Design a binder for this molecule. Structure first.
Ligand SMILES: OC[C@H]1O[C@H](O[C@H]2[C@H](O)[C@@H](O)[C@H](OCCCCCC3CCCCC3)O[C@@H]2CO)[C@H](O)[C@@H](O)[C@@H]1O
Ligand SMILES: OC[C@H]1O[C@H](O[C@H]2[C@H](O)[C@@H](O)[C@H](OCCCCCC3CCCCC3)O[C@@H]2CO)[C@H](O)[C@@H](O)[C@@H]1O
Ligand SMILES: OC[C@H]1O[C@H](O[C@H]2[C@H](O)[C@@H](O)[C@H](OCCCCCC3CCCCC3)O[C@@H]2CO)[C@H](O)[C@@H](O)[C@@H]1O
Ligand SMILES: [Cu+2]
Ligand SMILES: [Cu+2]
Ligand SMILES: [Cu+2]
Lengths: 95, 382, 49, 382, 382
């Protein structure tokens, strides 16, 4: 839970500048969106990008906290798994 | 660069780029330029190329040597991915603003999800100056007027250097003492609690509580210096308008087409029928962005890239005028070096020997009306 | 890319995938040596890379 | 209830419900009522909402407090799921017949497979009486006239109570004797065959052969009391007719739109062009089922739910008449409390700040012809 | 054969085959024949049958008793799979050339990927002669004039017999010596190297180096006897033209339809409206390839298979002429034995009791214009 819940807070002071909106050629874009539109990624076009887009079964913000918690829960499962995997990895057995 | 390697029939049977215009071909850092034109989405789109329900109008350049200040299809800004539809003809403009000096082969292009990069024709464009001149001003909806080429860069370098050094700290708090062999012995020997002392024990609680504190406050201090933020804007733009176009003044039928292997030329037999009010002559055959021109009818006013320009390339057997009514079977021959440079002649290796392209007719007034051809393309061998 | 750092997916994927190696390295370093910079050696190594 | 929680742009950019009519708003158990109207399938349908190739016309109520005696799209009964197509406008009717007394907020709605519930506007409807009055008669193709609210219910309760008691039997045939500790000892001790005696052994063959017998006969006795039965009828109904509609008498262009955050109002700048034979005035803006009306042009004759009615809501800068020909750029302002009640103002949180809605013009005769708008929706901040 | 087993509603609601013509019905080995006609892709195509984005025009015969010398949709050769589209009507021709003597029930058919075989009507065709007469000449693009019924067959039998015998060799080089019990003992006993001797050891290197040599050379010798080869040609052909047809001269509405179970007949109630310039009479109802004809209006000029021909099958209540304008509700009855032979009457078992079919009207001139009907099909029971 700590690992997931802290991830967005630990990053929001850095990216938040780039989330102020902009009326660019008629359309609302964040500055982050502007960066993507501007600095041409020839081999990484827009649809490849997997960001949130909304649902009819969804409520908007909050979307970040709800995701952070889900990440926290899956993160404990990943942790159990990866502790045992690590114990396995730290093994002095010979063959 | 890069499209000579793609299957020839793909490039013929996919998107047709025509009437391109480049508003400059030398430019200074911050001076913008404009590529605009039309493209056709060939209704016989290959099987193994997903129909372009989700496509994106990119430009091909090695890194952002330009920035894409704008791009439009149908007079709509298209920063997101669009839906195009088989059969339709679209017009486009991209507004490039220069950034990095050099000699750049700029391609306009169309990424098709589930398809690949569909690469339009490129013309060399030269940027001069020093890239340090580059400036990318934006007026935000809170305005505030920023430069997006450096905005928030002192915050990233700040916060990343802090947390990294905060980490290096934790690691040097301990690597002060001996790390491995003595701690090993200590643990094996039953004495593992001897190695976490109570100073240790909540020097730890400092870093913990500190990191949480430095998070929660600077969190709260960020939703103050920027009290209005919106989530990234994302999602496919379906309703993209096209031209639906005057349905052809001239009605062309490819009764047969062929090419000599090896060879630098393609030969069609067209039966042509003028249904306009004036007379027409065959100006141009345009396949895979190569423009085969009959010099006695058309001169290129657009500075088409010369490696795709065949200025005296199209050789029409009997290219007399053609008044309303009246049908005539003709013998066309499209020859030029582009046919081997750009490996259209490599169609001999493709698993679908069929072609498609544009035909341009001009009346004596000067109006070009455009017609589209596609049929098999049978090879001939000595 | 900054225009991929969203609220749904990035918030989900990055913790889950990144907690792995820490939990692996902790598993050995902590219990075999009471070493307590397990997660941080990893995250230091990533960011440097 | 339930749609204020859905993303604002979804509800604006999905299905547009307009010209709804409720034939009552109080009704007695067995008295039917009628909701009918039109809906538009917005051609800029969101990415993450599957195009409505497979959709179903439901109604939103907590349980069958009504029953749905009928529902039509295009004068076709639609008990199965239908194919709708982006761009088209459809008309609909649902025939509700009341069942359970109470105060019910009845929503007409459209489930879109791969999409979600697309929720239309609801108006309170009140049922009075005792639900025990409810009767649901059907004349079968063998007729026989049944009541479907109770038909075959004595057979289910019969046969289920039989087989359950047949089961409880088997369990009490044995739990008569001691079950656990003594049988355990008996088995461990090598003496497990001592516990299934030969009476046991085919008391068992009774129940077995009995259950098979009671199955095969009552099976055969059912294909007699009902000698004609057909399988459940199932499968998508594709060919659903729509209106394809007089293509707009008035041609609206949204040159810019915006909204004040915070705030209860949305502001557009329309350039409007009458191509009819009479003159028109702007009566209504309709987005997300909120109807913004200019009181000096239109009064609502439909009993639209008042929490979505803005009776003096639309404030057109220069709303004079507009004779054939003649273009005029106008300043519109849609204000009302619905814009915050129904959290259309929560668009500030959505990852696609774009809107879509209907515009209604009336000529001096009285004919409303309807036009559709959609463009970005840029926020303004103090 | 084989289509009486398919769900009745499928065959009614899928592809409609009409105006078929068989140019012979007895033929000699090498004599070609022609099946041509039209087909309609019913816009209410079943759910569980993928829309025909990828379909193939096959013929149903037990093995290549004919060969398919050609097949066209819309005057395009269709050797690959095509895209058809719901709603449209297509014309087709297949050119069969006979190969194997016998009595063959030849079906024209349409495989729909993700769907199944959609089976058109079959007529017995009789081939006479000896199949040894069959010859399949082809002039290659290098020409060379080959017979494709035997070309390269001596090379396959050659090379396969060589490599097989090369294999049998290797196995008999060794099964000369004792194979199992003595080699077993030898290996167990620590003496496994005793069993691969140095003669053994590179008799082995012979076969190895030989096989590689015989590969590399005969490889190189093949790219000489055939210096021009192309890869297999493959990929979906999307742009398949259809008729888009004079939109019906007559406007039919099925107000109700039904069928008697059991029974050999189907009954509709049509309201019919002539919008042409001459008068019409109802000639034909055509469902599931059964042609119900009113003998007092139409005689079959096509040699339709008689088990699907109902020459006096359609019984129109009041089948008088019908001049331009004027509407008339009529009572139709389609009766014949085909309705039970071909198990259209098995619709009682299908999970979608709805029908679709063609209606043919002739004016006094003789022009048949065709109209399409589809509605539920309610059963009636004694
Ligand atoms: O100056 C007096 C001290 O020096 C010696 O120990 C040194 C060691 O000799 C000295 O080499 C050691 O250095 C610690 C840092 C070295 C690794 C630095 C980091 C590299 C990057 C990330 C983590 C580790 O720190 C100790 C104390 O600061 C003596 O042995 C100590 O007993 C004594 O307290
Ligand atoms: O009445 C004389 C009998 O009573 C006693 O045994 C009883 C037991 O004391 C008596 O408690 C027992 O009850 C059996 C039913 C109790 C559980 C009923 C079911 C609950 C629901 C599903 C399965 C089990 O049945 C036995 C015989 O009917 C004596 O011990 C028996 O020896 C004697 O035959
Ligand atoms: O003719 C003199 C030889 O004959 C005998 O051995 C025979 C055996 O008796 C004889 O039966 C044996 O036959 C080998 C072939 C039999 C299996 C043939 C293949 C069947 C198909 C695929 C692989 C095996 O070959 C040996 C040598 O050719 C003697 O025992 C040998 O010592 C002697 O060299
Ligand atoms: Cu290039
Ligand atoms: Cu409600
Ligand atoms: Cu058959």
């Amino acid at each position: 839970l700590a690992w997931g819940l802290l991830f967005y807070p630990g990053n929001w002071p850095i990216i938040a500048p780039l989330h102020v909106p902009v009326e660019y050629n008629g359309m609302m874009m964040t500055l982050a969106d502007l960066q993507g539109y501007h600095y041409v990624r020839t081999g990484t076009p827009e649809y490849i990008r997997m960001v949130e887009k909304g649902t009819l079964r969804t409520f908007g913000k909050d979307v970040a906290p709800v995701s952070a918690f889900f990440s926290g829960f899956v993160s404990i499962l990943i942790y159990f798994l990866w502790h045992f995997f690590g114990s396995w990895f730290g093994s002095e057995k010979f063959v | 660069h890069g499209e000579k390697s793609q299957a020839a029939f793909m490039r013929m049977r996919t998107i047709h780029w025509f009437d391109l215009n480049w508003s400059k071909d030398q430019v200074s850092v911050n001076e913008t330029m404009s590529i605009s034109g039309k493209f056709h989405v060939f209704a016989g789109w290959p099987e193994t190329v997903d129909k372009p329900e989700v496509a994106f109008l990119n430009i091909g350049i090695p890194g952002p040597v330009f920035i894409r200040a704008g791009s439009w299809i149908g007079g709509q800004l298209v920063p997101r991915s669009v839906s195009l539809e088989l059969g339709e003809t679209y017009e486009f403009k991209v507004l490039l603003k220069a950034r990095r000096p050099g000699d750049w082969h700029v391609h306009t292009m169309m990424n098709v999800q589930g398809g690949g990069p569909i690469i339009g024709p490129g013309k060399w464009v030269t940027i001069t100056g020093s890239m340090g001149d580059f400036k990318n001003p934006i007026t935000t909806l809170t305005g505030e007027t920023i430069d997006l080429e450096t905005y928030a860069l002192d915050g990233v370098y700040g916060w990343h250097l802090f947390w990294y050094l905060l980490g290096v700290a934790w690691m040097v708090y301990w690597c002060r003492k001996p790390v491995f062999i003595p701690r090993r012995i200590a643990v094996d020997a039953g004495k593992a609690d001897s190695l976490i002392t109570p100073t240790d024990k909540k020097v730890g609680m400092a870093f913990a509580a500190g990191t949480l504190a430095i998070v929660a406050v600077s969190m709260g201090q960020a939703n103050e210096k920027y009290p209005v933020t919106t989530p990234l804007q994302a999602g496919l733009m379906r309703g993209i308008k096209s031209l639906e176009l005057p349905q052809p003044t001239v009605s062309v039928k490819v009764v047969d087409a062929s090419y000599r292997v090896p060879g630098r030329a393609m030969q069609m037999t067209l039966e042509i029928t003028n249904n306009g009010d004036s007379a027409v002559r065959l100006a141009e055959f345009n396949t895979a962005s190569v423009r085969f021109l009959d010099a006695d009818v058309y001169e290129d006013d657009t500075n088409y890239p010369d490696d795709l320009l065949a200025e005296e390339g199209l050789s029409v057997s009997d290219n007399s005028p053609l008044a309303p009514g009246e049908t005539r079977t003709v013998d066309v021959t499209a020859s030029d070096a582009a046919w081997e440079v750009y490996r259209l002649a490599d169609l001999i290796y493709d698993p679908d020997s069929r072609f498609a392209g544009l035909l341009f007719f001009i009346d004596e007034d000067g109006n070009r009306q455009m017609t589209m051809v596609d049929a098999p393309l049978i090879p001939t061998f000595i | 890319w900054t225009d991929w750092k969203d609220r749904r997916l990035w918030v989900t994927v990055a913790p889950i995938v990144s907690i792995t190696f820490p939990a692996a390295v902790q598993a050995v370093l902590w219990w075999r040596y009471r070493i307590a910079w397990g997660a941080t050696l990893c995250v230091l190594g990533l960011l440097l890379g």
